[PDB]
């Protein structure tokens, strides 16, 4: 609604996945939940779990 | 267009409301704990096709 950027790491928004809008101007978190699954794969490829 | 007030007054842990909208985006059960159609959506013509 405002076309203004909002960034950050913060609070309760720990890896929030939703169908946000196309025209929203905002990026947040860090890795995705599948990139998190990829590092969880690199974890299971350390001890062949 | 029926969509902004549902987001504001849907924050407060608000149960399911029936409103005769044109929200297709009413199967997104995290972003709304509150929607209920009273008219089938734009996609719901599909089983109508399937018959």
Residue A27 token pair = 């990026």
Of how many residues is chain A composed?
Answer: 49
Residue A20 token pair = 């946000």
**A39 marked among binding-site residues:** no
CA A4 to chain centroid:
20
Name the resolution in angstroms. 6.6
Mutate one of B5, B24, B30, B33 to test the A interface: name it (highest A CB count within 10 A). Answer: B30
Chain B residues 1-51 within an 8 A CB cutoff of chain A: 25, 28, 30-31
- Gap between the Cα atoms of A21 and A19, Å rounded: 7
- Gap between the Cα atoms of A8 and A30, Å rounded: 9
- Gap between the Cα atoms of B51 and A30, Å rounded: 46
If we measure between CA atoms, which residue out of A36, A5, A42 comes closest to residue A23?
A: A5
Residue B35 token pair = 């929607």
Contact A44, A23 (CB under 8 A): no
- Gap between the Cα atoms of B28 and A19, Å rounded: 8
- Gap between the Cα atoms of A3 and A22, Å rounded: 11
Residue B26 token pair = 């009413």
Contact A20, A1 (CB under 8 A): no
């Amino acid at each position: 609604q405002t076309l203004t950027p909002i960034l950050g790491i913060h609070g309760g928004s720990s890896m929030i996945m939703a169908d946000k809008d196309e025209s929203s101007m905002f990026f947040q978190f860090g890795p995705s939940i599948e990139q998190q699954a990829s590092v969880m794969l690199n974890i299971m490829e350390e001890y062949d779990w | 267009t029926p969509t902004p007030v549902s987001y504001t007054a849907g924050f407060y842990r608000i149960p399911v409301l029936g409103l005769t909208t044109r929200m297709s985006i009413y199967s997104d059960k995290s972003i709304h704990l509150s929607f209920l159609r009273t008219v089938p959506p734009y996609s719901h013509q599909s089983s109508v096709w399937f018959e």
